[PDB]
Design an enzyme around this catalytic site. Structure first.
Site, PDB file in Angstrom:
ATOM      1  NE  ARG A  17     -57.208 -50.332 -43.723  1.00 55.77           N
ATOM      2  CZ  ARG A  17     -58.118 -51.227 -44.518  1.00 55.77           C
ATOM      3  NH1 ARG A  17     -58.453 -52.575 -44.760  1.00 55.77           N
ATOM      4  NH2 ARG A  17     -59.079 -50.755 -44.634  1.00 55.77           N
ATOM      5  CD1 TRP A  27     -54.415 -43.564 -57.022  1.00 62.86           C
ATOM      6  CD2 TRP A  27     -55.672 -43.601 -55.508  1.00 62.86           C
ATOM      7  NE1 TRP A  27     -53.562 -43.841 -55.775  1.00 62.86           N
ATOM      8  CE2 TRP A  27     -54.570 -43.710 -54.525  1.00 62.86           C
ATOM      9  CE3 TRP A  27     -56.936 -43.521 -54.863  1.00 62.86           C
ATOM     10  CZ2 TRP A  27     -54.712 -43.919 -53.449  1.00 62.86           C
ATOM     11  CZ3 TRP A  27     -57.001 -43.357 -53.257  1.00 62.86           C
ATOM     12  CH2 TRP A  27     -55.799 -44.455 -52.622  1.00 62.86           C
ATOM     13  CE1 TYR A  86     -52.482 -45.274 -47.035  1.00 61.61           C
ATOM     14  CE2 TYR A  86     -53.058 -45.081 -49.527  1.00 61.61           C
ATOM     15  CZ  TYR A  86     -52.747 -45.112 -48.423  1.00 61.61           C
ATOM     16  OH  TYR A  86     -52.960 -46.255 -48.330  1.00 61.61           O
ATOM     17  CB  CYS A 137     -54.057 -50.507 -47.749  1.00 61.72           C
ATOM     18  SG  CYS A 137     -56.982 -51.605 -48.092  1.00 61.72           S
ATOM     19  CG  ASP A 181     -55.616 -59.097 -54.049  1.00 59.94           C
ATOM     20  OD1 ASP A 181     -54.295 -59.694 -54.858  1.00 59.94           O
ATOM     21  OD2 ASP A 181     -56.401 -58.919 -55.042  1.00 59.94           O
ATOM     22  CD  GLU A 196     -50.742 -44.760 -56.048  1.00 58.81           C
ATOM     23  OE1 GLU A 196     -49.194 -45.043 -55.803  1.00 58.81           O
ATOM     24  OE2 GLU A 196     -51.797 -45.268 -55.992  1.00 58.81           O
TER      25      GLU A 196
HETATM   26  O1  LIG Z   1     -52.667 -49.917 -52.240  1.00 55.34           O
HETATM   27  C1  LIG Z   1     -53.275 -51.107 -52.389  1.00 55.34           C
HETATM   28  C2  LIG Z   1     -54.602 -50.100 -51.994  1.00 55.34           C
HETATM   29  C3  LIG Z   1     -55.504 -51.703 -51.579  1.00 55.34           C
HETATM   30  N1  LIG Z   1     -55.045 -52.231 -51.476  1.00 55.34           N
HETATM   31  C4  LIG Z   1     -56.143 -53.786 -50.817  1.00 55.34           C
HETATM   32  C5  LIG Z   1     -56.411 -54.368 -50.177  1.00 55.34           C
HETATM   33  C6  LIG Z   1     -57.695 -55.247 -50.082  1.00 55.34           C
HETATM   34  O2  LIG Z   1     -58.307 -56.178 -50.441  1.00 55.34           O
HETATM   35  C7  LIG Z   1     -58.197 -54.323 -50.134  1.00 55.34           C
HETATM   36  C8  LIG Z   1     -59.008 -52.652 -49.424  1.00 55.34           C
HETATM   37  O3  LIG Z   1     -60.036 -53.329 -48.794  1.00 55.34           O
HETATM   38  P1  LIG Z   1     -60.204 -53.516 -47.884  1.00 55.34           P
HETATM   39  O4  LIG Z   1     -59.819 -54.393 -46.864  1.00 55.34           O
HETATM   40  O5  LIG Z   1     -60.338 -52.414 -47.225  1.00 55.34           O
HETATM   41  O6  LIG Z   1     -61.936 -53.933 -47.011  1.00 55.34           O
HETATM   42  O7  LIG Z   1     -57.095 -53.273 -51.492  1.00 55.34           O
HETATM   43  C9  LIG Z   1     -53.833 -53.270 -51.596  1.00 55.34           C
HETATM   44  O8  LIG Z   1     -53.199 -54.377 -51.679  1.00 55.34           O
HETATM   45  N2  LIG Z   1     -52.577 -52.547 -52.638  1.00 55.34           N
HETATM   46  C1  LIG Z   2     -54.869 -53.453 -56.442  1.00 56.23           C
HETATM   47  C2  LIG Z   2     -53.596 -52.244 -56.721  1.00 56.23           C
HETATM   48  C3  LIG Z   2     -52.288 -52.325 -57.297  1.00 56.23           C
HETATM   49  C4  LIG Z   2     -51.248 -50.549 -57.133  1.00 56.23           C
HETATM   50  C5  LIG Z   2     -51.958 -49.344 -56.983  1.00 56.23           C
HETATM   51  C6  LIG Z   2     -53.560 -49.217 -56.379  1.00 56.23           C
HETATM   52  C7  LIG Z   2     -54.174 -50.873 -56.833  1.00 56.23           C
HETATM   53  C8  LIG Z   2     -55.719 -50.299 -55.732  1.00 56.23           C
HETATM   54  O1  LIG Z   2     -56.423 -50.897 -55.986  1.00 56.23           O
HETATM   55  N1  LIG Z   2     -55.451 -48.486 -56.208  1.00 56.23           N
HETATM   56  C9  LIG Z   2     -56.333 -48.223 -55.651  1.00 56.23           C
HETATM   57  C10 LIG Z   2     -56.697 -47.448 -54.313  1.00 56.23           C
HETATM   58  C11 LIG Z   2     -57.882 -47.036 -54.034  1.00 56.23           C
HETATM   59  N2  LIG Z   2     -58.815 -47.251 -55.359  1.00 56.23           N
HETATM   60  C12 LIG Z   2     -58.544 -47.391 -56.427  1.00 56.23           C
HETATM   61 CL1  LIG Z   2     -59.623 -46.782 -58.059  1.00 56.23          CL
HETATM   62  C13 LIG Z   2     -57.498 -47.946 -56.561  1.00 56.23           C
HETATM   63  C14 LIG Z   2     -53.873 -48.056 -56.230  1.00 56.23           C
HETATM   64  O2  LIG Z   2     -54.062 -46.868 -56.177  1.00 56.23           O
END
Ligand SMILES: O=c1ccn([C@H]2C[C@H](O)[C@@H](COP(=O)(O)O)O2)c(=O)[nH]1
Ligand SMILES: Cc1cccc2c1C(=O)N(c1ccnc(Cl)c1)C2=O
Ligand SMILES: O=c1ccn([C@H]2C[C@H](O)[C@@H](COP(=O)(O)O)O2)c(=O)[nH]1
Ligand SMILES: Cc1cccc2c1C(=O)N(c1ccnc(Cl)c1)C2=O
EC number: 2.1.1.45
Lengths: 289, 289
Positions: free
Chosen positions: B194, B78, B122, B174, B197, B56
């Site tokens: 920004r 994704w 991205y 994010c 999780d 990815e």
């Molecule tokens: O690669 C990623 C993509 C998303 N998130 C998390 C951050 C937020 O919890 C959520 C996105 O939701 P919003 O905060 O944008 O509403 O997904 C990650 O930690 N890593």
């Molecule tokens: C939690 C985590 C951990 C590692 C990698 C990823 C995610 C995540 O939610 N996504 C993601 C972002 C946006 N849409 C999707 Cl369906 C997935 C990732 O690519």
């Protein structure tokens, strides 16, 4: 004390900073935090001109990019890159000819429109971002309306960084991006600043973004939280070493407290008299370089 | 240990995090640092799928926004927002119909072009930013060419944030922005994220950006420095409390060391076999929610 994070970072670039070509001493990745409920973060260890902070904030917040507003306020902060844009011109024929620019710009509408206007500076990126379709976006407008409505979003962001402009433009914004956060009553702001002069610029940078966080907290009915100031490359020039060193020799005093008019609520229509700084008692200013 | 900053931040959101509406526990402004010369920051206290990180990343770095590449690599990261874009469609008539999407997308060119493509993700922001004139910019391309040429600039920046798109788009990035810094031999990267999780996303986020910093250090003939990971709002969901808690009960082991092919040098043309992880020995994976 509240301004201690500033002094720690200047101390740290001094001791463990890295040299690079007069050249610099720099450090990558530092953060400073300031609880704005314990006072306002104007430096007391050096005098910092708050009405210059004050006016150059309200200028951005009107969406204004013309020098006139800043000169009608005795603020001469942004004039250089304006002056710069009249000498490399089709028209052109220092210390005194720069007093010229200022009455001409100040009084001549068709002159203030060519050379007053810096173009791509913060007022436009904040309040009028240019789009693909040639419309324009008020992101800060959108954001504040979001704070009121959705105080818990993790999308409360304002960028000054335009990958389309930044290769061409005169000065790529140092104040790259900022983000708001609300939590049980209080508004915090964090700033990503990609590049910082620790001696000259940083002491202002903090006051502007602390003031910005208070103003925005004011409009949305909220009390104020942290201002977190995050650096890419915070650096000292090698010809500001004794000045900062000497400043390290001094002992902070209580921080001032800011005062904002208690029934004007939209900061976009603010003017000076609407913001007061109370009990600011600084050590003297330091000339440099 | 190298992964200690991760565990500290999860500990801290657990103890002093703030609640907000299942809802969250969050903290604003935290930073993590990782000296990448002491190893690679894949978590050992939990198993983290590195070939998913690996694929990815290369997907983004080709400028690719079609799901097919990720499915030809057994990475299903994704797919959701792709699946999401075929059901709200003009065409549409879970666990098994999502196996449908994947052979159709995988094998049907005129299907992979409508529904494979996530659009504003991205790979486009990094390698094809859309401009006012409808040209396109490779910012990461531009940046890397800048690192080689001007390693000391404070303008080595890549934004994924488009104030024009972010009101409309499916998922505002994010991973908002990042910046490079060089200093006597070594490449550091800092990321402004920004929203994070802490349990599910953060452990990947760190591996991707550590890997990205190594790959870019590789192309520019440099040794690797810090990866600094800066948060707006890092949060725990209230239904991942025991999982993370249990993960806190475990004791990191030596960090793995990464290996990159020693005479391929442009990461844009990389495929899997070009990056190897050595001596990765993790505690087991944890299901959740
Ligand atoms: O690669 C990623 C993509 C998303 N998130 C998390 C951050 C937020 O919890 C959520 C996105 O939701 P919003 O905060 O944008 O509403 O997904 C990650 O930690 N890593
Ligand atoms: C939690 C985590 C951990 C590692 C990698 C990823 C995610 C995540 O939610 N996504 C993601 C972002 C946006 N849409 C999707 Cl369906 C997935 C990732 O690519
Ligand atoms: O409001 C400002 C504007 C500029 N700078 C500094 C940071 C950098 O030293 C310099 C900009 O030069 P570059 O780093 O962009 O090349 O000015 C500040 O500290 N505050
Ligand atoms: C150091 C410092 C401190 C406070 C405020 C400012 C600066 C500065 O260089 N500028 C500035 C930025 C771009 N061009 C110019 Cl003519 C001035 C400021 O507005």
């Amino acid at each position: 004390m509240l301004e201690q994070p500033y002094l720690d970072l200047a101390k740290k670039v001094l001791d463990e900073g890295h040299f690079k070509p007069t050249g610099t001493y720099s450090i990558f990745g530092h953060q400073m935090r300031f609880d704005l409920s314990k006072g306002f973060p104007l430096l007391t260890t050096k005098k910092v001109p708050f009405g210059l902070i004050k006016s150059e904030l309200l200028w951005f917040l009107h969406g204004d990019t013309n020098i006139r507003f800043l000169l009608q306020h005795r603020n001469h902060i942004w004039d250089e890159w304006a002056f710069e844009k009249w000498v490399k011109s089709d028209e052109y024929h220092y210390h005194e000819e720069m007093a010229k620019f200022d009455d001409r710009v100040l009084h001549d509408d068709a002159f203030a429109a060519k050379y007053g206007d810096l173009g791509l500076v913060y007022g436009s990126q904040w309040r009028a971002w240019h789009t693909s379709k040639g419309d324009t976006i008020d992101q800060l407008g959108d954001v504040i309306e979001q704070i009121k409505t959705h105080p818990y979003s993790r999308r409360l962001i304002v960028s000054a960084w335009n990958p389309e402009d930044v290769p061409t433009m005169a000065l790529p914004p140092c104040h790259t991006l900022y983000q708001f956060y609300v939590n049980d009553g209080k508004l915090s702001l964090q700033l990503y600043q990609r590049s910082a002069d620790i001696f000259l610029g940083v002491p202002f940078n903090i006051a502007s973004y602390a003031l910005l966080t208070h103003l925005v907290a004011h409009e949305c009915g909220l009390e104020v939280g942290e201002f977190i100031h995050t650096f890419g490359d915070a650096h000292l020039y090698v010809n500001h070493l004794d000045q900062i060193k000497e400043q390290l020799s001094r002992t902070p005093r209580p921080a001032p407290t800011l005062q904002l008019n208690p029934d004007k609520h939209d900061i976009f229509d603010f003017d000076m008299k609407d913001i007061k700084l109370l009990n600011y008692d600084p050590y003297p200013a330091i000339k440099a370089p």
